[PDB]
């Protein structure tokens, strides 16, 4: 079990040796911090990416020593110590060819090793934040509850809704009304904001349903999700919710697109007040009228709107049911198409000797953070873990590393907390 010096050394060596998009980006970003040029920056970041002052300010906090290195597909974290025992984390999010989309250097997110479920609760609780932790073992005759805090509370879940979109898509594939190799076309009206990369493709770009669904899940791609939602039709997405495991489908009718949440939530305040006072009919009418190219930009987001219904609300039971249903859908799909999409990005470094398969999905919106996993061992025993936070102020929640890291610690301690 690695001592401090051992683990820091192992992290430093791993970072140097990481021959991958994350390795390349993490080494370059560390270079900015430890060294003593606008062209070289332009080339490392996404084309649509002040930074000189940002880097000066970061550099002033050093010198830095690498203490941990956590690459996970297109996301990565490097834990750094600066003088006098102060720690920071460098977070990286990459696009599909390894360009940097997000790069931040922030005070360390501290998550202790978990021994008990009470450790989880006492760590997570923040005044002003509603949270929920739900962990179950799935069995032939129902779920065994390992731990529950407020699983009955319906809460906003952001991109967790893409799990329902996935089930709706699979239901249509099974019916033969859509095919995995059918072509979807990106138009100006179908473009959404990140998370995701598909928005960066040119107008007219032709992409298969398979590759669109893959990015929808694996990259939480908002534009990919909206392409699927457009192809299926809102009625098909909605008509599905009851089957795919939702307790009060009226909470997600009309079933919003990401474009609609962004545009309604952070655009015209009058149009947003109209939503609030309208019934289901008036809301559908309002959405039809709002259809077109987005006006809202990433810079406009901030204020919370989930409390107005402009998000996707479900309880913890709903999340378990949709994941269990996807496990069932995957098994029925003998081609392995569903399984490949679901397992591409497990959100953490996974012990593959323990877990045969891991599904993962995150959701985030101002004032909203959630992470969920389905983990199935090699004997076939499945566990589901659902973590949720909502608040009236985004600063109370933060960038989501806290809640993700709590999940990481639970999964690390699975023998104590899940499978005991």
Ligand X SMILES: O=C(O)[C@H]1/C(=C/CO)O[C@@H]2CC(=O)N21
Contact of 320 with 384, CB cutoff 8 Å: yes
Binding flag, residue 366, ligand X (CB under 6 A) = no
> C-beta of 408: minimal distance to ligand X in Å?
4
Candidates 384, 321, 381; CA nearest to 355 is 381
45 by Cβ neighbours in 10 Å (0-12 / 13-18 / 19+) ranks as middle
Q: For residues 170 and 387, which CB has a smaller minimum distance to ligand X in the complex?
A: 387
User: Does residue 147 belong to the site contacting ligand X (CB under 6 A)?
Assistant: no
70 contacts ligand X (rule: CB under 6 A) = yes
- Please tell me whether residue 362 binds ligand X under the rule CB under 6 A: yes
23 binds ligand X (CB under 6 A): no
Counting contacts by CB under 6 A, is residue 184 touching ligand X?
no
Give the integer Cα–Cα distance in Å for 150 and 392.
18
Nearest-angstrom CA–CA distance, 126 and 132: 12
Q: Is 347 an interacting residue with respect to ligand X (CB under 6 A)?
A: yes
Distance from C-alpha of 308 to C-alpha of 275, rounded to nearest angstrom: 8
Among residues 58, 64, 77, 134, which is the contact residue for ligand X, using CB under 6 A?
77
Tokens of 63: 């010198």
Residues 253-292 binding ligand X (CB under 6 A) are none
Q: How far is the CB of 311 from ligand X (least distance, A)?
A: 12
The answer to the question of residue 8 lying near ligand X (CB under 6 A) is no
What is the number of H-type helices and E-type strands within the chain? Answer: 16, 13
Binding window for ligand X (CB under 6 A); candidates: 147-155, 267-275, 318-326, 399-407: 399-407
Under a CB-based contact definition with an 8 Å cutoff, are residues 403 and 389 in contact?
yes
Task: Kindly state the number of chain residues that form the binding site for ligand X, as judged by CB under 6 A.
Answer: 20
Q: Which tokens in the block code for residue 73?
A: 């597909």
Please identify which residue in 23, 363, 366, 367 interacts with ligand X, judged by CB under 6 A: 363
Least Å distance, CB 77 to ligand X, is: 5
| Contact between 408 and ligand X per CB under 6 A | yes
CB of 22 to ligand X, least distance (A): 12
Query: Does residue number 79 form part of the binding site for ligand X (CB under 6 A)?
Result: yes
State yes or no: residue 224 binds ligand X (CB under 6 A): no
Residue 199 CB, shortest distance to ligand X, in Å, is 13
| Residue 402 touches ligand X, criterion: CB under 6 A | no
Residue 336 — left, alpha, or beta (φ > 0 → left; ψ -120 to 50 → alpha)? left
The closest alpha carbon to 168, from 207, 216, 204, belongs to 216
Q: Does 71 bind ligand X (CB under 6 A)?
A: no
Residue 151 interacts with ligand X (CB under 6 A)? no
Left (φ > 0), alpha (ψ -120 to 50) or beta: where does 292 sit?
Answer: left
**Residue 156 or residue 171: which is nearer to ligand X going by CB?**
156
Contact 236, 172 (CB under 8 A): yes
Specify whether the CB–CB gap between 306 and 156 falls below 8 A.
yes
Figure out which of the listed residues 220, 240, 257, 394 binds ligand X, where binding follows CB under 6 A: 220
CA dist 35 and 244 (Å) reads: 53
Please identify, among the stretches 19-27, 116-124, 244-252, 358-366, the one whose residues bind ligand X according to the rule CB under 6 A: 358-366
φ/ψ (deg, to 5) at 219: -110, 5
- Provide the token pair at 6: 């051992």
- How many Å apart are CA 212 and CA 198, to the nearest integer? 8
CB of 348 to ligand X, least distance (A): 6
Residue nearest to ligand X (CB): 400
Return the structure tokens found at 218. 């694996």
Q: Does 346 bind ligand X (CB under 6 A)?
A: no
Summarize as ranges the residues that interact with ligand X (CB under 6 A).
68, 70, 75, 77, 79, 111, 158-159, 195, 220, 347-348, 362-364, 400, 404-405, 408-409
């Amino acid at each position: 079990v690695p001592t401090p010096a051992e683990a820091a050394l192992a992290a430093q060596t791993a970072l140097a040796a990481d021959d991958s998009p994350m390795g390349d980006a993490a080494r370059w970003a560390m270079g900015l911090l430890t060294s003593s040029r606008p062209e070289d920056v332009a080339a490392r970041f996404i084309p649509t990416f002040n930074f000189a002052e940002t880097v000066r300010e970061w550099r002033s906090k050093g010198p830095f020593t690498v203490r941990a290195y956590h690459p996970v597909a297109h996301k990565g974290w490097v834990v750094l110590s600066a003088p006098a025992g102060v720690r920071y984390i460098l977070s990286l999010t990459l696009d599909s060819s390894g360009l940097i989309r997000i790069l931040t250097l922030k005070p360390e997110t501290v998550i202790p090793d978990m021994v008990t479920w009470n450790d989880v609760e006492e760590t997570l609780h923040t005044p002003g934040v509603q949270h929920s932790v739900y962990a179950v073992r799935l069995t032939p005759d129902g779920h065994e509850v390992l731990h529950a805090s407020a699983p009955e509370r319906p809460m906003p879940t952001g991109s967790a809704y893409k799990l329902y979109l996935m089930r709706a898509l699979v239901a249509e594939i099974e019916k033969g009304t859509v095919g995995w190799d059918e072509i979807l076309t990106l138009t100006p009206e179908l473009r959404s904001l990140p998370t995701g990369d598909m928005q960066d493709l040119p107008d007219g770009t032709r992409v298969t349903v398979r590759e669109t669904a893959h990015k929808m899940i694996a990259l939480s791609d908002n534009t990919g999700a909206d392409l699927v939602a457009d192809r299926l039709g809102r009625e098909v997405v909605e008509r599905s919710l009851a089957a795919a495991g939702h307790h009060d489908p009226s909470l997600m009718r009309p079933f919003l697109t990401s474009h609609e949440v962004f545009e309604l939530g952070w655009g015209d305040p009058e149009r947003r007040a109209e939503w609030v006072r309208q019934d289901e009919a008036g809301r559908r009418e309002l959405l039809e009228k709002m259809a077109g190219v987005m006006t809202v930009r990433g810079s406009d987001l901030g204020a919370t709107v989930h409390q107005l219904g402009i998000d996707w609300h479900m309880d913890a039971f709903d999340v378990v049911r949709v994941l269990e249903g996807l496990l069932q859908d995957s098994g029925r799909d003998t081609s392995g198409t569903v399984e490949e999409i679901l397992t591409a990005y497990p959100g953490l470094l996974i012990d593959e000797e323990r877990w045969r398969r891991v599904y993962f999905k995150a959701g985030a919106s101002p004032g909203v953070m959630m992470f969920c996993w389905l983990l199935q061992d090699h004997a076939g025993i499945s566990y589901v873990l659902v973590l949720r936070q909502s608040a009236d102020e985004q600063r109370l929640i933060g960038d989501g590393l806290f809640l993700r890291g709590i999940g990481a610690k639970i999964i690390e301690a699975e023998a104590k907390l899940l499978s005991s």
